[PDB]
């Protein structure tokens, strides 16, 4: 399904995904200063319509599952520091963050890259998101730039995603918050 | 081996530094390299100081790392690309501003050491020459992580121009 996706793509369309996953944090840092809105760069705008147009011709053959690890960062402020005491989640404050984020709908401003399970999953960040993303939807497998697994999945910007189900995963020497979700 | 010279605390954070380095930096970085704005991350800090002050070269090596453009900072990480190629009239800027000084990286230092390979499809490309009698602990395949603060003074950079890509090379050497 790479192989399908490139055949759709223009020569400066791939190179364009390239840098993109090689170099994801400034278009992404740039989106979420900004609340997915462009115009405020025009120059990287150019960039940002054209890969928006690539993953257009990308569509997914089947319903797939993937994940994405994160630090506490991605709650914001008032959570981040709060929500772990030493090793183990904040129960209190998870409380709040879970009434705060479950059964809603949430966007993702940048681009939305995730990893795909072989014969393992890297949870070691605080946070554990797995996502199901419907048949049908754009997203286009990338290559790795971990060179771990061979490829990942690439969704739009402005990705949204309902939060089905969020709780404290209890391990042997950790806890992490699994959020559970279902791309709209 | 230099396993052997960690207490078992001192494994552990080395260990908690490999599953979530980016909070660490972050907040380094953020803060200048400075402590103390959040105390409870000075005190892992201050542990893995000194852990990795229980390490030592014994011979100069050749590291490398891979960066994406935003070390540049806001007004040259979205814009030192264009067309897939380097803006030359930018890059000027960016090596009149950065090649021949000193300076100070605030997070840890990880680093990857040639075998076979050298993975290089991040936009920027940093090799250093790292000292003889320097600090720097091997962790888990095997990086090569130097202490925060870190000084190097950037010896030269240019545009590698590949068959279809272009990589901005820093080559650096790592000060006492
Ligand atoms: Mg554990
Ligand atoms: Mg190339």
Redesign the pocket.
Known sequence: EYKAWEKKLRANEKELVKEYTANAKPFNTYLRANEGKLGFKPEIDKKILKLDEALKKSKLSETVQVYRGDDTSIFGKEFQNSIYQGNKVNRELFRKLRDEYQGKIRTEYGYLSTSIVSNQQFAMRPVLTTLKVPKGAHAGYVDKISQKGQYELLLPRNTKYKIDKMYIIV????E?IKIEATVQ
Do not use: A, D, E, L
Not at 171 to 174: D, I, T, V
């Open positions: 391990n042997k020497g950790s992490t």
